[PDB]
mmCIF file of C-alpha atoms and ligand atoms in Angstrom:
data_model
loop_
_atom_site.group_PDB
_atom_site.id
_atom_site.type_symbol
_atom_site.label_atom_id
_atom_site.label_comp_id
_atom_site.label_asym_id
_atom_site.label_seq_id
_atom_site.Cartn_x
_atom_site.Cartn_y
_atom_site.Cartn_z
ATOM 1 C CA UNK A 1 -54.888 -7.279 -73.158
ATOM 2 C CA UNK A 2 -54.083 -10.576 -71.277
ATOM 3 C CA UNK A 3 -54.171 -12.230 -75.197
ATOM 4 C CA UNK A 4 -51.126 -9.472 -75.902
ATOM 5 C CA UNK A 5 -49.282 -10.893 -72.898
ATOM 6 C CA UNK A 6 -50.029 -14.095 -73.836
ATOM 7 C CA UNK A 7 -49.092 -14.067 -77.548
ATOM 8 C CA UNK A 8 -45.498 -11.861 -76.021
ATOM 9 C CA UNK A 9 -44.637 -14.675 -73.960
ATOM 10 C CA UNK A 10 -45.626 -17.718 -76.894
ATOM 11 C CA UNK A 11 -43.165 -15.393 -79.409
ATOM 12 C CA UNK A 12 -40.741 -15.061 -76.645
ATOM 13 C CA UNK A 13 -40.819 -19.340 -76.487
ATOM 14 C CA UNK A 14 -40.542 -19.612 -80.692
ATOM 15 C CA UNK A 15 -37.294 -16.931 -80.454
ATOM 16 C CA UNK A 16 -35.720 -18.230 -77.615
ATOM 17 C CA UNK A 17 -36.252 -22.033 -79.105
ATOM 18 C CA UNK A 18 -34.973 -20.894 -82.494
ATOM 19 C CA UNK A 19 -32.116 -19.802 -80.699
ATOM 20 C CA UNK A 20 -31.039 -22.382 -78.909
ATOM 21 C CA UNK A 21 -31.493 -25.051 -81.373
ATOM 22 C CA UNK A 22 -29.489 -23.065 -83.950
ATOM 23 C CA UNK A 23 -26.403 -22.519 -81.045
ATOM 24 C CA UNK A 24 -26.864 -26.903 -80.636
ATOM 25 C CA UNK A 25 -27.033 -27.402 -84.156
ATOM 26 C CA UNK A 26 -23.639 -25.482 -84.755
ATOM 27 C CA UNK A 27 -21.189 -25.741 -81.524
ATOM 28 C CA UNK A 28 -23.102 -29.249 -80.506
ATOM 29 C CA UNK A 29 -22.434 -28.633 -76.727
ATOM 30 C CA UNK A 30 -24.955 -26.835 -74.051
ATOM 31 C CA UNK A 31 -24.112 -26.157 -70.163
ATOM 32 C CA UNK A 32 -27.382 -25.832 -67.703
ATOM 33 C CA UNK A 33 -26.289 -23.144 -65.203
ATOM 34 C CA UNK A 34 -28.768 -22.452 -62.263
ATOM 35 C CA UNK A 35 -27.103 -19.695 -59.558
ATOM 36 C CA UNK A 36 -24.488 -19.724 -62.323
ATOM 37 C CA UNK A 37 -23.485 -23.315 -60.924
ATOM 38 C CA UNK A 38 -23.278 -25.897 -64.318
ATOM 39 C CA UNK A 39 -26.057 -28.628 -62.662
ATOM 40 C CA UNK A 40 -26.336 -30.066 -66.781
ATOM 41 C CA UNK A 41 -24.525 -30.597 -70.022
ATOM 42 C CA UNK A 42 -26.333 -31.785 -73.498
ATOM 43 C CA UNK A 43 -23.296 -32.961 -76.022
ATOM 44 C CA UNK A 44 -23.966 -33.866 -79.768
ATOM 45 C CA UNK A 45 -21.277 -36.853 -79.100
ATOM 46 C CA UNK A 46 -21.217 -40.173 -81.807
ATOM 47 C CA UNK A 47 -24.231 -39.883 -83.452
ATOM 48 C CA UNK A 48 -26.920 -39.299 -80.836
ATOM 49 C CA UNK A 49 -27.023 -36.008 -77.721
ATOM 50 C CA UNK A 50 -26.231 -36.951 -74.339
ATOM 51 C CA UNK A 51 -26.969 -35.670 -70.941
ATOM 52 C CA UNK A 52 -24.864 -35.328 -68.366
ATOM 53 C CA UNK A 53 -26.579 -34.629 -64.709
ATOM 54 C CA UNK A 54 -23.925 -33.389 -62.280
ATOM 55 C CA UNK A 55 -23.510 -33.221 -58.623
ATOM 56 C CA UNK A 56 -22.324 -29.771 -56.399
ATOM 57 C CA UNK A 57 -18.891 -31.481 -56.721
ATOM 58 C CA UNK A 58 -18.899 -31.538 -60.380
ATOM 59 C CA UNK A 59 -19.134 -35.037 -60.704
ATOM 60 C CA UNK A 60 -21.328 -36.946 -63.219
ATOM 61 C CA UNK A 61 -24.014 -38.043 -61.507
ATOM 62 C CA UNK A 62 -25.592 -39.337 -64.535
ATOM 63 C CA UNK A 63 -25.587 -40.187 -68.093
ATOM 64 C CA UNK A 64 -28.624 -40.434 -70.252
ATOM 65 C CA UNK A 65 -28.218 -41.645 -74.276
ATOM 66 C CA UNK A 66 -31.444 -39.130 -75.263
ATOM 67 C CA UNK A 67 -31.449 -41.590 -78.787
ATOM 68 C CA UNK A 68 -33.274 -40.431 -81.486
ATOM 69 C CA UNK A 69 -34.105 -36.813 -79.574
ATOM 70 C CA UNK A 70 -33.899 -33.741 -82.414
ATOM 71 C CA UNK A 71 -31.943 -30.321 -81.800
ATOM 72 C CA UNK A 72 -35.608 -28.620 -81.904
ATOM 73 C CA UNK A 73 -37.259 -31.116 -79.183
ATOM 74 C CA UNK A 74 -34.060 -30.501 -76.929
ATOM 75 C CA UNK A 75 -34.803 -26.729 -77.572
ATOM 76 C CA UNK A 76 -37.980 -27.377 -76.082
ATOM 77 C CA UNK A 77 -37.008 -29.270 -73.356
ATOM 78 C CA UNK A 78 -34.227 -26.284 -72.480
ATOM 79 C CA UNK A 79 -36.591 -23.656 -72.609
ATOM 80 C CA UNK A 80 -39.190 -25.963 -70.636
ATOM 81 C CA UNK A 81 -36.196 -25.974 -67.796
ATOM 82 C CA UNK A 82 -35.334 -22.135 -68.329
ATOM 83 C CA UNK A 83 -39.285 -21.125 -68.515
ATOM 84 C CA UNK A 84 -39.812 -22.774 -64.846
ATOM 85 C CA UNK A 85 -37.156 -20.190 -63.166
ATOM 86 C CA UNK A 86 -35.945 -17.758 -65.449
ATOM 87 C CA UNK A 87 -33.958 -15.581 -63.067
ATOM 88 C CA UNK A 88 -31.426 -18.802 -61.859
ATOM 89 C CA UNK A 89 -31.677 -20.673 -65.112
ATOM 90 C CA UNK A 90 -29.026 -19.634 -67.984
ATOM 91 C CA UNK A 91 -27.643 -21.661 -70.420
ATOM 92 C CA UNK A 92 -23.887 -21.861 -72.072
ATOM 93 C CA UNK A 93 -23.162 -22.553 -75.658
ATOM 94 C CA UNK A 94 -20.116 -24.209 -77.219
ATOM 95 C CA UNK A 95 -16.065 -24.870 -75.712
ATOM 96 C CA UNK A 96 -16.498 -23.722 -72.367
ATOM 97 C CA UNK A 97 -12.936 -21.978 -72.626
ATOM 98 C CA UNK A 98 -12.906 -18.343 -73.108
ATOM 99 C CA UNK A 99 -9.560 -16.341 -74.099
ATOM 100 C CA UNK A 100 -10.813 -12.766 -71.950
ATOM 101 C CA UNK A 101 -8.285 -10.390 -71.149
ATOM 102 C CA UNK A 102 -8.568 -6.780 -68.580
ATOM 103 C CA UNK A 103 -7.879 -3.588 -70.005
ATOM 104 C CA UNK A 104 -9.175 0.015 -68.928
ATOM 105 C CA UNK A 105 -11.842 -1.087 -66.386
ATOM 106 C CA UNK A 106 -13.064 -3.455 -69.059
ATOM 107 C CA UNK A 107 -12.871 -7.399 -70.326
ATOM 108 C CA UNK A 108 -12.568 -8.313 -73.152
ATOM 109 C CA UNK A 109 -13.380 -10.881 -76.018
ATOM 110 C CA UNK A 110 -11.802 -9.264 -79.675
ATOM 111 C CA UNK A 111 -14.757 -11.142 -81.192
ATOM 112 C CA UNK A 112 -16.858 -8.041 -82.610
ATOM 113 C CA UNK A 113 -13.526 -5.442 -82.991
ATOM 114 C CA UNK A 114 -10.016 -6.010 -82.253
ATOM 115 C CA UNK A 115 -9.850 -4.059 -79.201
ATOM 116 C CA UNK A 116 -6.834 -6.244 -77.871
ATOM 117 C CA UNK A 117 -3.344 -6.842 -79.457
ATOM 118 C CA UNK A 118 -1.387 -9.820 -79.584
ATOM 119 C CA UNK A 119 -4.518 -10.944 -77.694
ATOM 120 C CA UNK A 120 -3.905 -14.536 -78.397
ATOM 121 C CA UNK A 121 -0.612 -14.624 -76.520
ATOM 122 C CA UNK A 122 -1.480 -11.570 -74.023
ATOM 123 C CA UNK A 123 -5.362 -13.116 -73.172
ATOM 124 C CA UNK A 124 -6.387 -15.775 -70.445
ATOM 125 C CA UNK A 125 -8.373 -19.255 -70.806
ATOM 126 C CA UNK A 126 -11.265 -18.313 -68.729
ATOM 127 C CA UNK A 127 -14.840 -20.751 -67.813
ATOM 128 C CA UNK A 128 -18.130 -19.792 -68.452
ATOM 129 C CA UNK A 129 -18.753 -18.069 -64.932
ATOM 130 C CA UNK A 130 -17.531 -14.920 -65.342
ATOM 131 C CA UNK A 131 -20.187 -13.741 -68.413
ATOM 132 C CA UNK A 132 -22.944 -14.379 -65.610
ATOM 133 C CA UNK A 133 -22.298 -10.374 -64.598
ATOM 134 C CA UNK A 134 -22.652 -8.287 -68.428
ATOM 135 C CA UNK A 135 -21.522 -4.854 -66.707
ATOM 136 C CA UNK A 136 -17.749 -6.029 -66.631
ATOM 137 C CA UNK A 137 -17.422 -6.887 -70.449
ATOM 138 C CA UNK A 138 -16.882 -4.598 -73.581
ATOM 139 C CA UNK A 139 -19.569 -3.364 -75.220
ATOM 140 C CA UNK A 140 -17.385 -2.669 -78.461
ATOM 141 C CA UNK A 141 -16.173 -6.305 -79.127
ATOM 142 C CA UNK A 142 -18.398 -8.770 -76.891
ATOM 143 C CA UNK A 143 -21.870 -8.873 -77.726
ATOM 144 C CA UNK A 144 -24.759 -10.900 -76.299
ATOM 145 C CA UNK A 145 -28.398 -12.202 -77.284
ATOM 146 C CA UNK A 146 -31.054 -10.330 -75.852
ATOM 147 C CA UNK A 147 -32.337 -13.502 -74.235
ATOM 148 C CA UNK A 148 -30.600 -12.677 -70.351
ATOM 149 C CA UNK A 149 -31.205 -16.694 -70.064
ATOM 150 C CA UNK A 150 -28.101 -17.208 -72.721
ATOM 151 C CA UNK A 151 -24.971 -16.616 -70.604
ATOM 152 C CA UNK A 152 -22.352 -17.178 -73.706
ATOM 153 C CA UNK A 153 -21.756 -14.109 -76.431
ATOM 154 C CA UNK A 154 -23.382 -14.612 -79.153
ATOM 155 C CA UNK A 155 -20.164 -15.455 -81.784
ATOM 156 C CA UNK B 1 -38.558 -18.523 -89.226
ATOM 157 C CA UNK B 2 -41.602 -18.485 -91.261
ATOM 158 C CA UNK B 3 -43.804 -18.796 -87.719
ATOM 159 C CA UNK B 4 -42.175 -16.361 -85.839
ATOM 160 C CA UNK B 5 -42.348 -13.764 -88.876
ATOM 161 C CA UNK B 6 -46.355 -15.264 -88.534
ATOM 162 C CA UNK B 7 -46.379 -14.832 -84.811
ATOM 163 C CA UNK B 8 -45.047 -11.037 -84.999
ATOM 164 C CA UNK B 9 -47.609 -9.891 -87.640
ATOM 165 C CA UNK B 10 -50.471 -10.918 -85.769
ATOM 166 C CA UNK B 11 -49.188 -9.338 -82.905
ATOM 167 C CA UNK B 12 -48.559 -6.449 -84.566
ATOM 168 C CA UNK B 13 -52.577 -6.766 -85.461
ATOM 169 C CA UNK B 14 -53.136 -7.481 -81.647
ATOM 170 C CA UNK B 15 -51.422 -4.369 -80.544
ATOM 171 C CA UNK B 16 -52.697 -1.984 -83.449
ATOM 172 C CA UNK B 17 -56.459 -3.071 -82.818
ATOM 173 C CA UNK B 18 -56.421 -2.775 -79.312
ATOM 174 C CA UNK B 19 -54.639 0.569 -79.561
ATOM 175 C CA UNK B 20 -57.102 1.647 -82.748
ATOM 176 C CA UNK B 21 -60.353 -0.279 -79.881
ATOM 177 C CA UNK B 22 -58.862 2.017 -77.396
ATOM 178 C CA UNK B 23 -58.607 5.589 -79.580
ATOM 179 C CA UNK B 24 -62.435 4.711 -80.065
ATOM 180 C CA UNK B 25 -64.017 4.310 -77.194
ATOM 181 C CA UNK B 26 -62.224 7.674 -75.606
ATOM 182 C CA UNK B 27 -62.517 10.178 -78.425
ATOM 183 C CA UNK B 28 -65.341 8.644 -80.279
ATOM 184 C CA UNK B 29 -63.861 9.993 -84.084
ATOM 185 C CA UNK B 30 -61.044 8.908 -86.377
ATOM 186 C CA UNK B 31 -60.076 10.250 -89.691
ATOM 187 C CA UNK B 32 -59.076 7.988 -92.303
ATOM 188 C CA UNK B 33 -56.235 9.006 -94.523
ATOM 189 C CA UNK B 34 -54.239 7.703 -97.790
ATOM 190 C CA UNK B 35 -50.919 9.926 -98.666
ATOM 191 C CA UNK B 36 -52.224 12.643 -96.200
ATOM 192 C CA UNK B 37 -55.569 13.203 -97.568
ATOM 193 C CA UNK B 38 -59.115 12.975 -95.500
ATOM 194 C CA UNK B 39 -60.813 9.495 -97.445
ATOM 195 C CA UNK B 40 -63.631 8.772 -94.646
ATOM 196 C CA UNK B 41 -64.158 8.928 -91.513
ATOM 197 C CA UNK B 42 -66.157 7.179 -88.510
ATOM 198 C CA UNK B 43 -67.525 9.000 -85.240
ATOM 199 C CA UNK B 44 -69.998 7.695 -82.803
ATOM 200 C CA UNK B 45 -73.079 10.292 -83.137
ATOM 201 C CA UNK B 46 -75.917 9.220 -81.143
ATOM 202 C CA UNK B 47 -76.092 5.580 -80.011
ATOM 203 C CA UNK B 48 -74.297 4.262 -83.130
ATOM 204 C CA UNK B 49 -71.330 5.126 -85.116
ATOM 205 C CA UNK B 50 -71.380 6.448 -88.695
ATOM 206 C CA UNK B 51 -69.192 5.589 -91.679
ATOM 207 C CA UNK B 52 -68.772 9.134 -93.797
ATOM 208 C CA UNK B 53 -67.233 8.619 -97.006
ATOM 209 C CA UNK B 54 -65.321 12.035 -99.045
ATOM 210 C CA UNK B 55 -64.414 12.874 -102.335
ATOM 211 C CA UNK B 56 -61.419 14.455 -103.390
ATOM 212 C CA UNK B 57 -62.837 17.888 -102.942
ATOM 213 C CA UNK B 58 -63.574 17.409 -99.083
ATOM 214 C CA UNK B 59 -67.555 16.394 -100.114
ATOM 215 C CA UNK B 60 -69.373 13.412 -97.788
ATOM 216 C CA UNK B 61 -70.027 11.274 -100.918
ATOM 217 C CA UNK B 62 -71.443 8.520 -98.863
ATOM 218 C CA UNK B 63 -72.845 8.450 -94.925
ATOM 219 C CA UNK B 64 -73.391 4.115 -93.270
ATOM 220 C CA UNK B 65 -75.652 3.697 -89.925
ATOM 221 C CA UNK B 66 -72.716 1.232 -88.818
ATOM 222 C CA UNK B 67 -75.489 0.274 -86.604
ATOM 223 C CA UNK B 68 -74.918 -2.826 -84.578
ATOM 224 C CA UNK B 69 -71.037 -2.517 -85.268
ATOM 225 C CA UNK B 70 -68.689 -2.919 -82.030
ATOM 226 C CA UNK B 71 -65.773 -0.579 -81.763
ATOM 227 C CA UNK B 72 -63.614 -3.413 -81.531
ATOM 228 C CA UNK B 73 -65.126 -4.796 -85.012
ATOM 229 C CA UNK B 74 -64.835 -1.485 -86.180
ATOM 230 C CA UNK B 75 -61.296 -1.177 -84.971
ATOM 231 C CA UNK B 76 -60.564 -4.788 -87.154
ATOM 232 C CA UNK B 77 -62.007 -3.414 -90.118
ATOM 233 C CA UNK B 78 -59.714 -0.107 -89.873
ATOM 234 C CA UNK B 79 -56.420 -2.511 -89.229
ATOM 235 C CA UNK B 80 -57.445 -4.444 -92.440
ATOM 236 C CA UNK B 81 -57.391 -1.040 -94.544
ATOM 237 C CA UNK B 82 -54.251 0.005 -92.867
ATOM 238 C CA UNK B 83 -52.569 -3.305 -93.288
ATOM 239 C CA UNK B 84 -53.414 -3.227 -97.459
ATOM 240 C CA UNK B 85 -51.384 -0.455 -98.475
ATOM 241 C CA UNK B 86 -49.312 0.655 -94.675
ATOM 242 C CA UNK B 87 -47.028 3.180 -96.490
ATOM 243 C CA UNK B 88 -49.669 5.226 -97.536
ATOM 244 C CA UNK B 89 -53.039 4.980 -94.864
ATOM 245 C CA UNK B 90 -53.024 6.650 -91.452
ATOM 246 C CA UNK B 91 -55.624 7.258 -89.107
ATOM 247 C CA UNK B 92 -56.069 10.997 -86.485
ATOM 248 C CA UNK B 93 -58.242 9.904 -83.519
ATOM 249 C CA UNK B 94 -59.792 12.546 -81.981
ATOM 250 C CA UNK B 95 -60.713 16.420 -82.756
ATOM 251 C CA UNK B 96 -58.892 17.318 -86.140
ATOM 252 C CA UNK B 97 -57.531 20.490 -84.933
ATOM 253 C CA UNK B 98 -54.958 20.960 -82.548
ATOM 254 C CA UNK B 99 -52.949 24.002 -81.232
ATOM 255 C CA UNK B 100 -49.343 24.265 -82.617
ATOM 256 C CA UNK B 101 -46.080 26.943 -81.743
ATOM 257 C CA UNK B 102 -43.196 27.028 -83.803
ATOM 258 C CA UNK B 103 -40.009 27.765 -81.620
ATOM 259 C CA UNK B 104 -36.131 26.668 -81.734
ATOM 260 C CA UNK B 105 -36.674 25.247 -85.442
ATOM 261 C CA UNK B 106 -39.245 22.573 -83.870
ATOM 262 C CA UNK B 107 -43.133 22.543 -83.391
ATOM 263 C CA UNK B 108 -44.878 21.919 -79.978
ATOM 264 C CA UNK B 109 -47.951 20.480 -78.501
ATOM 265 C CA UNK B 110 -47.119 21.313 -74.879
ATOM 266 C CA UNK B 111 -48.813 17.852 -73.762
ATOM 267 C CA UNK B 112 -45.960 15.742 -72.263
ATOM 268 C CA UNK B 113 -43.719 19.721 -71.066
ATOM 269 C CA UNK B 114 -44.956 22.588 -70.975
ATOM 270 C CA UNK B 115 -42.267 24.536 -73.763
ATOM 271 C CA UNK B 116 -44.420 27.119 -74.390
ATOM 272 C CA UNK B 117 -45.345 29.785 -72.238
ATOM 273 C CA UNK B 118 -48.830 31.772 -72.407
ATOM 274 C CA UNK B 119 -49.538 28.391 -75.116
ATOM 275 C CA UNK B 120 -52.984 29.204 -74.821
ATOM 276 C CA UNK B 121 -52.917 32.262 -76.079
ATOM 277 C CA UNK B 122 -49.532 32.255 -78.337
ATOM 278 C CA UNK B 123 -50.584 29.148 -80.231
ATOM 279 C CA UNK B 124 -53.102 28.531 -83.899
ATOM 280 C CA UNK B 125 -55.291 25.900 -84.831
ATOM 281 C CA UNK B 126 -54.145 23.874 -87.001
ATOM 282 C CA UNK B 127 -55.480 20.575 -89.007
ATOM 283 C CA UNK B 128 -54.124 17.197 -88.620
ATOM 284 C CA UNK B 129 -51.980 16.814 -91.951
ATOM 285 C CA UNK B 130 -48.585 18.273 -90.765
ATOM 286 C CA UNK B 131 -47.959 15.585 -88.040
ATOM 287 C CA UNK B 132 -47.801 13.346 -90.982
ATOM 288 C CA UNK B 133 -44.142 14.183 -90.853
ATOM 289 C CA UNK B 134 -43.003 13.781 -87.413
ATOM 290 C CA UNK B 135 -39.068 14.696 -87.780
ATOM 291 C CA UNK B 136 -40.330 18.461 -86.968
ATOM 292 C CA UNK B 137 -41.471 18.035 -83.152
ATOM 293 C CA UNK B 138 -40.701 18.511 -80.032
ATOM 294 C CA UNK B 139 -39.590 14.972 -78.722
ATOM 295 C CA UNK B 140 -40.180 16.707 -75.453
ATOM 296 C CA UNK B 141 -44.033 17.756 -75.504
ATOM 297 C CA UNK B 142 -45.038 15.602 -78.732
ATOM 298 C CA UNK B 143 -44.847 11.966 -78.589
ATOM 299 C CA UNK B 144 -46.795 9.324 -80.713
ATOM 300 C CA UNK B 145 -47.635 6.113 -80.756
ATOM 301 C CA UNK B 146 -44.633 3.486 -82.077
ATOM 302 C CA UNK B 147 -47.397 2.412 -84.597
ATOM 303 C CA UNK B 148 -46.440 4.813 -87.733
ATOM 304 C CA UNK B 149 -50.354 4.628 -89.041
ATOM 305 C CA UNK B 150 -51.319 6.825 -86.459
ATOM 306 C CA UNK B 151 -50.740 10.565 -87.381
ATOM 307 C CA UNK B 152 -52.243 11.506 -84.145
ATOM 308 C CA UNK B 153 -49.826 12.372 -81.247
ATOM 309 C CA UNK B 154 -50.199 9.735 -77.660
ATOM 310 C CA UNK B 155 -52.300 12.299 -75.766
HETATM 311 ZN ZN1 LIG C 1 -13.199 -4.564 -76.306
HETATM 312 ZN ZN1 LIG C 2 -41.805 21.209 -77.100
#
């Protein structure tokens, strides 16, 4: 029933939404990836989200004071962005900086089971890149949303 | 979220209607039943479909020209019992009686692998009642729906 596909993909929107504006509402800081290149960045900074627009280079191309914009009509917008190319457009939520660290054929985060030991001395500060690919990481301690279009593990 | 929790019952409804629609228009009959007994059924005899109503001792009590009545109104009205009391009413689509084989501590149906040889002829005739419990069946040859309120196997 086209209505069925149509009420999957409007319950898709209200999930993925909720999602995001829960992961702005508690680490305050979004990268826009598209080709898992960051071409974005929305930051809770003062009292009022920002948005960055940046260049191939990396530099800030742009800076836009989004005012009295809410978490939930940023969601929107995000998804809007995500909606329009879904199989380029991923998103990364919170520090950018990863601690990862290689062990038997797999990498790893210690976030859902301390698979690692003296991890925080023995692990690497890592960017966002490298969680593009989910076939490299642990399944036992890094876990992700089921939304493909949210790059960073969820906790 | 309230809406989403919204937005997945009345897909839910969507799916279960259309699948109930569906059941309809191919076999024509389905058996209504509350904790595993036989409480009505409706079957398209003629150009219309009829609404037979039963007794505890297996006596039609009641018989309704539906008349008019689409299958996909029909097909509402049979979600909206289900959806009163889910735990308790199911629905068989189709002939009642279906040919069963016990083997290897598991029951077959032979429809999606053929387990059983000489089935035809090796196999008894059996009501709908005991796939009201579907832990005993071969996962191989008996599949159902997802939708627990249909007893009937997929096929
Ligand atoms: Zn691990
Ligand atoms: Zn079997």
């Amino acid at each position: 029933n086209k209505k069925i596909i149509v009420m999957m993909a409007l319950l898709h929107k209200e999930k993925l939404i909720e999602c995001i504006y829960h992961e702005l509402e508690n680490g305050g800081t979004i990268l826009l990836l598209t080709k898992n290149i960051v071409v974005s960045e929305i930051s809770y900074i003062g009292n009022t989200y920002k948005y960055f627009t940046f260049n191939d280079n990396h530099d800030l191309i742009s800076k836009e004071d989004l005012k009295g914009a809410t978490s939930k009509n940023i969601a929107k917008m995000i998804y809007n962005w995500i909606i329009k190319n879904p199989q380029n457009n991923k998103i990364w939520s919170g520090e950018p900086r990863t601690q990862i660290y290689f062990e038997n054929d797999l990498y790893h985060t210690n976030y859902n089971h301390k698979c690692i030991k003296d991890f925080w001395n023995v692990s690497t500060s890592v960017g966002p890149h490298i969680f593009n690919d989910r076939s490299i990481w642990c399944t036992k301690c890094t876990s992700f949303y089921p939304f493909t279009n949210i790059m960073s593990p969820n906790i």
